Symmetry: C5
Subunit: 212 residues, 5 copies
């Protein structure tokens, strides 16, 4: 019943509406959110030499894949709320503050008009298109670019991150370019920053392309 | 009477106001939406070569034609509501989340200030201008460009798509350019993705133009 | 001027706030809006050749003049609302959905922060600055550009358009450029489009400039 | 007391919240606003030749100085409200609709995130950074540009403007560039436009720079 | 406990929601805010010569670190509110109107989606990514750029600024680029402007880079 599904969504989001979306998605003991992160390269928009040196600005189109558990968004799918999943705007719920740390701009842009899917067990799946702009090195007809992703404010004890499906690499399931990929690797690291005390998960990707 | 036309719109949109626009547009049994989709090319803004290779970024101006049934928006056209249709803003109702998947930008942009028309039987007709930016291949004086569209989060059992008027081609009813069309074809496919275990409808268009 | 003027505004706008701005501006019998439309070229921002062919993107700065009657916004200029006119934001009242049909972008842009003036008899006068981008033919030291304007969703029976001051031409009352105008004419037509059965008013301007 | 300072703001703004920001800021009826206006050039962003002719688009960074009396925002500085002034967002009160009439874009841009200061007698001082884009003439190593400002919809009987501190020139109090200023004058005129009945104040500035 | 954390935030923010975020952050006697300010250069996006002279527009990516005390945001860290800190959105609280005075655009941009952290004694720590665009001098293979930061409307008796950790230099703790830094110094100045009577704190940074 369509009415019941919309009523369900309203009941679930009432918490976020009343208490706000800030803060880890827990009402009981504060736990650790483990985010599964995937980066799916679609295409290269441009690689533009910076001045006359060996560096360049690389602009990429990708699909970013995020999954995590939100215990506030759980329900028991017994009638009249027998729904396995519901679609939800990501601006109406908590979302991980994972940012492209080494963005040449403020951050990558994610398409936050795309909906997330939340399952009855509170697992959220959000797969936003993204534009990423980073500083690359262009030498010997190769463009080497790095991407570092991490939660802005939450340490490893608050927000953890692991490769979605344990695939430590740029994903090619949405790939739609003709570029020759010469390197494609990634690593998860727990990084201490000079400004701050505790450690933060960093997902670091290295992508090397043949120059056109 | 004008006031009655406005009260009708208010009465119809009350559901969306109280409950939000997320979720398939059904109040009773949740069915399948079937979107008729038409892509009407108007002009080419630019085709710009990427680096010194064979690919280029093609920027197009089009009109995207969408029609679907919203059962929430139905009325008996008996007086004093004897209106055949009413105009409504697309941001006050559910609209399909159809994205240009292979956009070089986050997505194509639709002019969401343009009104939709809704008829008394719940059929919605929305015809927004659109800007689309895709990767083309520019070889031997021919620019070949693909456009891939589909619902982001709804599978074929939830939101289906068919070509408007069953015309599987870029439509030329708004075409105002001087470019020579060398190929113009399109296919509807039900596609299974690695990430996800259901099939999604995709409309894939191929357009080839004589290069200027 | 004054709190009573503001109280007058609140009363006039209560209908639009309660009922919404969508729908023809008619209190009682729904009639036809007659829009008076004026296009006043101010200057050329740029004319940029498209690739290596004879077409170009011409970007213009203009002032667009619009007037129409809104019978909802009428009042008797008697104590204590003895005002001949008041200023109102265009986004608080119905406005004609008149679009630049052949825009290379989604539409021309109008400055919707500029206020409209409403007179006690319901006559609205709104004169927003505008930026217009269209495809021109640049041949033989002449740039020839067209502009096609019309209501997006309203047919001739619903919204009509006529040239302001009866001048079927681009108006030069705000012209501050040095370009030589070589051709300047316009036509009002009632047009049937392949998608739809009703006739829509189209205003088509032809402008031709000596090239720099 | 800091919370009393906030209570004062809330009480002052109550009127604007209840009645709206539109309309001249007299509490109430009869009155002419007199705006003091200053244009302080900070630097040249760029001058770009238009095509191959003698015209250019000049983009400038400036600080615009505005002051006027809002009689709605007056208070007696007696305890607990013994404040000589308070800060207020310009989007919470009426501001003059003073636009760059000859803008190549819709209008100059003002940083409306910057606060205004209001004194107890109702004097408002607002000093936003601004970006101004105009069409210049570039001949004989001189770039000559003009800037025209006026209220969009208010005539001289409604909104008047005078040069701040009676300085009829581009102010250099914030000048940080290296460009040689060759001419720098301004004139206040009362202008009748063909389109419209009344006279409107126009501050017309002339600035000539030695070309780099 | 998660609910308590959220209830605490809502309680702290209740003042800002009822009275507004404008005005200095003092529950009682209005005092002087002391802002600690750090600028961490991350990378150079571009240095673009302006015209054909010796000036250039430098666009930088940085991380701005800001800290001050907000007495409104204090709480006793006693059960059930035994939390050492909570994260809060900078758009729900007062933040210093610290602007890049010599910005070539309206201002530098800060990523205001990033969360601030507030400690129980009212100390707020906010570390937004930033894009800074300024005018530089490019002579003898050196690009010299200045950056001037200050509160826009608050004088020294209202908002003070001091260098974070008393390091009067551009900080290199997030520096990810290959450019050689030739000069790096900064000074805190109290400045009186011609336009206005009080003294304002200005943090002036000098950065010189080896040209590529
Ligand atoms: C609703 O209210 C509208 C606003 O008042 C009104 O619109 C205007 O109509 C007035 C009066 O007709 C117009 O003012 C005149 O414009 C014409 C042409 O520019 C002039 O010829 C005229 O001069 C008059 O000329 C006479 C001698 O030739 C002289 O004796 C008269 O004193 C007078 O000087 C006026 O200047 C004005 O342009 C209109 N304004 C706008 C914004 O449209 C509508 O007519 C009214 N609607 C209805 C249906 O009543
Ligand atoms: C309110 O709570 C906040 C958070 O707990 C608290 O701020 C913390 O204060 C400590 C101590 O001042 C700060 O620690 C400093 O960090 C910097 C660099 O990391 C050091 O330079 C400081 O050095 C100290 O030692 C110096 C010589 O070695 C001395 O010159 C100096 O005076 C210090 O003694 C010091 O280690 C810490 O940065 C903050 N924490 C955060 C995250 O803000 C604050 O003290 C409390 N405020 C009040 C008014 O009680
Ligand atoms: C309303 O209150 C405002 C704010 O106090 C008054 O404006 C201010 O007026 C004072 C007194 O004239 C000005 O001070 C003067 O400036 C000149 C020039 O530097 C100086 O030579 C004088 O000795 C004097 O100090 C001040 O500049 C001005 N401030 C601002 C920002 O406007 C205003 O006069 C009051 N209006 C009325 C009608 O009382
Ligand atoms: C929460 O429920 C969801 C949906 O049923 C579970 O997700 C699917 O799990 C199966 C089995 O591992 C996978 O094959 C699918 O890929 C998952 N679907 C999607 C779209 O994510 C999920 O595993 C459950 N979470 C927990 C904690 O068990
Ligand atoms: C709902 O009503 C609309 C409007 O009457 C129908 O659209 C008409 O459909 C017929 C048959 O397809 C077309 O020939 C006409 O062009 C349409 N009329 C207009 C004014 O557009 C629509 O078919 C109806 N939908 C259903 C499912 O019955
Ligand atoms: C509180 C607020 N902002 C932070 C920003 C950053 C960090 C910690 C923060 N803690 C380090 C880790 N994430 C990005 C930067 C550096
Ligand atoms: C839930 C949320 N987002 C999704 C995005 C996509 C898909 C499924 C999703 N499911 C696949 C189908 N549509 C676009 C991508 C790939
Ligand atoms: C309903 C919704 N959108 C429409 C768009 C157009 C038209 C009719 C529409 N009817 C024709 C007339 N105006 C522009 C295009 C074509
Ligand atoms: C009402 C609404 N808009 C107007 C725009 C202008 C004018 C009067 C208006 N009156 C003249 C003065 N200001 C700019 C243009 C021309
Ligand atoms: C009130 C409103 N705006 C101001 C802008 C500035 C100043 C004072 C202001 N006072 C001086 C200090 N801050 C920037 C400029 C110059």
């Amino acid at each position: 019943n369509g009415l019941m599904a919309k009523r369900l969504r309203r009941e679930l989001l009432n918490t976020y509406e009343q208490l706000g979306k800030s803060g880890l998605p827990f009402l009981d003991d504060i736990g650790k959110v483990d985010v599964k992160f995937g980066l799916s390269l679609q295409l290269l928009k441009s690689i533009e030499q910076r001045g006359m040196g060996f560096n360049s600005i690389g602009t990429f189109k990708a699909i970013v894949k995020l999954s995590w558990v939100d215990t506030i968004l759980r329900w028991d799918p017994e009638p009249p709320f027998d729904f396995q999943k519901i679609e939800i705007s990501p601006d109406e719920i908590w979302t991980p503050d994972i940012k492209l740390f080494n963005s040449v701009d403020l951050d990558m842009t994610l398409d936050r008009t795309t909906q997330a899917i939340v399952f009855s067990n509170g697992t959220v799946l959000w797969i936003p298109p993204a534009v990423l702009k980073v500083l690359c090195v262009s030498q010997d007809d190769v463009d080497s670019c790095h991407f570092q992703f991490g939660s802005w404010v939450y340490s490893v004890d608050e927000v953890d991150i692991h490769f979605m499906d344990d695939k430590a690499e740029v994903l090619l399931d949405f790939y739609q370019d003709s570029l020759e990929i010469l390197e494609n690797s990634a690593q998860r690291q727990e990084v201490v920053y000079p400004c701050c005390e505790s450690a933060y998960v960093e997902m670091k990707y290295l992508l090397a392309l043949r120059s056109e």
